[PDB]
Amino acid sequence: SNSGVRLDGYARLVQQTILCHQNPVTGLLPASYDQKDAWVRDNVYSILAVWGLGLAYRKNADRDEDKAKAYELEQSVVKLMRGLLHCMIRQVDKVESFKYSQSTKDSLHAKYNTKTCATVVGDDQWGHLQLDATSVYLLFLAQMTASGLHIIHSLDEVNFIQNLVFYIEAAYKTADFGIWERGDKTNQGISELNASSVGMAKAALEALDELDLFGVKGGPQSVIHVLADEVQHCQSILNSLLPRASTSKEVDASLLSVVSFPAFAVEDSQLVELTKQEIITKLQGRYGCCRFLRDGYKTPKEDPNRLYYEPAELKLFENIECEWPLFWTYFILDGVFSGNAEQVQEYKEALEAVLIKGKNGVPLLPELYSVPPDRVDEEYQNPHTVDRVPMGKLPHMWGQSLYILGSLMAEGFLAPGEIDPLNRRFSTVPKPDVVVQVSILAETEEIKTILKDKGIYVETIAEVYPIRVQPARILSHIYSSLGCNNRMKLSGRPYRHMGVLGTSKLYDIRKTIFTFTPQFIDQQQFYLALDNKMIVEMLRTDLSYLCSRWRMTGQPTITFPISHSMLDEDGTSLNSSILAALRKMQDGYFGGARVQTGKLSEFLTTSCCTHLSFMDP
Amino acid sequence: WKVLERRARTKRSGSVYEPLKSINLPRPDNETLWDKLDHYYRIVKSTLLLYQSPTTGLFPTKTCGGDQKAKIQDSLYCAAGAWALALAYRRIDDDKGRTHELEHSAIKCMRGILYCYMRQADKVQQFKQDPRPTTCLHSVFNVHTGDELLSYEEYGHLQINAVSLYLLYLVEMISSGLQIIYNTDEVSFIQNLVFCVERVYRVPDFGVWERGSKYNNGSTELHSSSVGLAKAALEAINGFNLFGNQGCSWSVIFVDLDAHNRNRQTLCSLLPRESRSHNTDAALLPCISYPAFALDDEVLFSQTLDKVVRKLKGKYGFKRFLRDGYRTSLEDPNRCYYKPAEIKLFDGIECEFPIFFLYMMIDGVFRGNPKQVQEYQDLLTPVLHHTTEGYPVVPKYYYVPADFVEYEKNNPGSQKRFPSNCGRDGKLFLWGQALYIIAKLLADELISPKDIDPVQRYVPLKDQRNVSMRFSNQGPLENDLVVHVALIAESQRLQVFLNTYGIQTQTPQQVEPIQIWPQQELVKAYLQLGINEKLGLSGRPDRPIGCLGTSKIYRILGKTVVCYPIIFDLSDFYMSQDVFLLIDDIKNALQFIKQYWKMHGRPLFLVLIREDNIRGSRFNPILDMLAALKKGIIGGVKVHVDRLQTLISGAVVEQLDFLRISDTEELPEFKSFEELEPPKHSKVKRQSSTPSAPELGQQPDVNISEWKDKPTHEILQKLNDCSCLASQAILLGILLKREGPNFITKEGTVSDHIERVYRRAGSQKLWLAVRYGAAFTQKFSSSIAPHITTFLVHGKQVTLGAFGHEEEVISNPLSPRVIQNIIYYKCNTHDEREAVIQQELVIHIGWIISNNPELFSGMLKIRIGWIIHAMEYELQIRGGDKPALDLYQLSPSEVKQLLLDILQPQQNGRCWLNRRQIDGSLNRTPTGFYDRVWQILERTPNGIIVAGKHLPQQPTLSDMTMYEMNFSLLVEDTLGNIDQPQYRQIVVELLMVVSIVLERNPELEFQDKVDLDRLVKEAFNEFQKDQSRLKEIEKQDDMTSFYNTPPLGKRGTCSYLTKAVMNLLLEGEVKPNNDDPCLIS
Amino acid sequence: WKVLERRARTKRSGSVYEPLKSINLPRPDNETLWDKLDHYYRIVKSTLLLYQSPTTGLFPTKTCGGD
């Protein structure tokens, strides 16, 4: 069959290009050239082509040769992921120490060595802070686990994954070195927040909400729980942080990795189109797109054997920046995934010309194109007019792997739903509406009698014995004991405040339904809870916030108890503000949300319930 | 052995360190294995292989007289013996060219059988459609030319046991390693033979003895042995490769799980007996022994073996069955058929077959019981005969001499019997000598049991763990199966709506690599399997696929195929319009899958959700069911939910490569399930439930009794200006009955009008109008036929008809057209709603009996009309003072609920009259009632007369036995003449009283025939006199007050019944038993 | 076992012609296989699987002293 001929041809190309450097014993390929070093992100991105080819081969089953090839590819990707996983285990102390007090001198080293899985660079000779690599590793591990592959093998592995997820969950308020490991335009030993990092972390957290690492045979003890507040905060930070690249960078081509096929961590498709148009206008060239404005990577000047560039780049690195075809490959993937056909054809036609042939006429993607030192003033005066020459790592496994995956997807041998079993392509589908449910509770019999006198039917704290109401500090303390193991010296999730998006969610502990009041009614913690107007106003704000995103499954449920500190001077009737708020509640409208008042038992029929297996004796 | 072997203590005693081996061990009696094998080869060559036609390789049944007929089972057993001898001789490298001869002899016998069967392909084609004795394969062929000899009018030729045994032996030989199947046309013929065998659970067969029954009157009946052999053959060939080691994926054979499940269900119930007329029969031994081993229970096997040993065992052999007249002294060799009461003369002079000693020896060596082996060998030594050269001969049977028949009858086993005609030199019994060779080889350890059983037909009690279609991984005593469940959303809007309520669902657009197919495409694909234009082959018949067949995964043309259960599709009836019925059916299917799954791997269950089944008030039950499924356990069955892509990964897939080999120029196109696009007119985005109340209530003012003779224009204008749905349906039905369906009304044709009104009534949940329209349109349900087949499998008879009127019995399964004709042409005098209610009742009772057979224990036949009267009376009682509402508007959910309350074991509470009415309507009798009736008939001369029907005593006692189901059927037929259920209950109680009185008092006997009506009348008169004396109440007609009396306590009905029966008994003579020492009494 | 299982001679003694199965057979001491499997799992988890290095999966010969 012609399809079989094309498949074996692609297998030959991938074997001659990437799989030839499989590096047995460990399974981590070198990062091209004479480097003898393994990058987590580079290996993870390179293994995508092998995973896609294995998925394509698995479809043509019922033959010994095809079955053997598919098994070999799957076991190869599994071996690579196990090697990277062992490398990550080799720094459990570093991860645990980073869990408290986030600092650049605490994160695991991004540069990992070859076989024997050791550290090749100390803690001060390189920037060992890259949340994007870890987040994309988690996302791809989740995607293949959902596909059917087995990678996680032990309970201690699940505990380590949970601890590392807790470590990466704080990416929205920390400064890292970014994908380029250089911070801002000037290195100067400075790190800053990056949109790519937070987007990747949010996507990894979302993709890892409930999934079981053990597959179908796994039980409730092998599931991983992630909070809802972190994902929404990351999404909000991304929304407020995407008119540009970062605080100092006006535009970066790495933003394409956030608003496209990799991790699909974006909404508001109009913003996506605007960002793509800005990137095209400010970065597109004759041999790919540039990284970002004012970059000095691989130039015929600025003393290449030097670091810590001084602020003297007024015009030295302007208009002569190198261009990377891997951005063209990313554009090809983005076009071929969602809905585009003509764009894919035009981008493939453009990319075919910049390709450089190799041994036996094998396609090879050059790392970058650089301007000749002689033709520099001409490029200054006439932008995008001079001709560049291919430099860098000629067998760039990153760009080559993405190009191979894009070609396989475009040829029709693979479907968009195979690489993404989690259905992340529909992340841009608008949400129609969500209805939030509220429950009104009475602290004492007098409160219930007063409410009944005012035409309000409520229930006291008693009579609901199957359900228990407790402050959110209790669930905070409970979640602080998640992923706790004494053998590998893991302290579990650090204690932290709990928002409103999870307190509304129902929790099942020891076969008992637990409902918790929101944390903002705690007068003991701080005194803003005393004021009536502040309480009703911020309750409206929280209701609005809950009604806005509500990314999680199921209906919500809010419990509002009536305390004795909210009564009038005589202590015989409720305050005017609270009474008006509850009257608006009964009318099914308050602020910008729709609510339906009812009983907790009625809401129990349809709501989001989470079971905590780690609390079992 | 050890210690004695060394003997190397040269100096006193001490530790020795030298090799010993085992060749130096003391040897048994000095005789090389070559000598014994050559002796066996000579015995075989001089007795078995000396009678074989070179042209066809079929062993003649007669060794002299130039007989041309040749049976199939004898040839199969001869081939099996030759193969066993070849396996014995395989143990020697220097065989001198003898193993090849024996293996060829087996191959040639099988090829002759195959050629004889393949000469009749049109017969196979006809048997596939309508299996009948007229259109069945012949069982005897010419030994010299392979031609048919006996016609259907003299032999019947209906024997499926031969085909099953041939298939099983072919499977065993191919697994052991042989070359018998050569071309693909042979594979297709084997496939069609499997198809013909696949429907053995319905067509009766004449049995192994060809006589048909114990009476031998040209009647066929179901036999346990045949069913067991067919089931064992079905298991043996499940997925077997017919080409041996040199085979590919396109040489495999296929069977469906539904037929095997039905055969197992039919076997596991009739197993303790042989048939309806046979309590015990020696032909059940092959079903549970060496060849078949089809009974994987170890308890029924032991019970049946003990029963057979207790009944049929004799000194000279084992009797075939009780009261048989084959070659007996009293038999008349001039009539093929027997006569009533003549069979009784064949008691105590039954022939004995020595081959069953051989069979029990084989079973003993297979099981590992050398005590039984040596006992049966010792019993077999004196009966054997030798030729001139000394070769042993097994006589076919032994018959008592005609002069000693009286002495044998007086003292069984006292007289001596004579050997059969084939029990001396000159006439040989090839079957007997073949089994003798096999058993002697097995006993002498010359063949290991594994050698002759490569397919592992027999499994030890500790290894009944992992066998396909036989045992589950838990074992034979546990059932905790987990069923994989995957939810499917009709559309993306449906997926979003389910997601908003905490339920995760997938759409067909999200599983692009996996195609979802309905049952029709799978049926069409299986139809194309057995195509052979050279001979003429129609392939698998167009039949539906059960739940077991839809739980697998198929790879067709390189594409993964998954099929949802047939429950999720609706065609014409309104039973699918109730969500509760759908949930109940899904739970029933889950329970059936859990209980009857024995394959490898967790079964796949697909759930289909449609937008039309969630609208309105029915949203809540669907959400509750989906939440229960997501929880993990639903209806006592554990389930798991996850993504379909993850589920399909790493699972065992079924391969169908016959489509690739097909020579059709254009490959057939199969239509997979496609996502439904959202509408562009209304855009209903799965709105809320919105219960509302746009409904009213009115009782129809039109009945067929008055609006019958009205002329056309008046009824036309009445229909035009009316608004009641029921009245419109009644008027349209009257128009169809009188004016015609093709008449054009104001709103079109009458047919279009009735269809539209039925559809709107179903949409608006108007059950009365829906049932009226269904009754008047003569609609039928395709599920009626499988339910009736399952009903007749479980041994329960069915009667169709209105209460207190003509009814039609269904003794054997019938085609859907015939049952539709019966149900639609036997209730014309009554309203047609009775047919619809009978169909609903049949469906419901079929489902519960398939799931909970214990609810219907104690009843032999089920009467639908009596159950209708039963729940009518139940609802009338429930209404109390207020009149009952109806019976045709409570919806099938409440109908099934009321049936469930009715079928409860006990309804204590309300007065005994209601209990007696319910008991009579349900036709329930206490356990052992038939045995007591038989005892009474034995102790009562001149028979019993009940409601005009009379039950003689002479022919029933002469022909029938104590535990025969035919006697139970006859008793039920006699007692069914009662019209009042209370009268039937009183009859049953009087019968029990008579039985207990007779058993407790053996002396008194009935002088003449008893009449139950007189006893009932006397009991009523005594009760009336007692009531008049006690309470000064004037005598009143009818027994309304008699039934209310409890049947025990102070002056109960039992007291009057026992007084009456004792008064009748003491009228007759009293015979004193001399055994009892009671004197002056 | 056989004969003991049937116990269906309602009236004196006679031949019973009913299915018997094996689920109704007399059965051993009150303990399901789940309890025994859980006991063995607890024993192994507190004894053997407790000593395994996550990095390599190698059980150590000495359980104390940091060997």
Ligand SMILES: Nc1ncnc2c1ncn2[C@@H]1O[C@H](COP(=O)(O)OP(=O)(O)OP(=O)(O)O)[C@@H](O)[C@H]1O
């Ligand atoms: N509506 C249904 N519900 C359940 N099982 C069904 C249904 N329809 C068909 N089946 C299954 O399909 C098979 C029915 O086979 P088929 O209709 O060819 O006839 P049958 O069962 O051999 O008998 P009959 O002569 O009564 O039709 C059985 O496995 C039955 O369980």
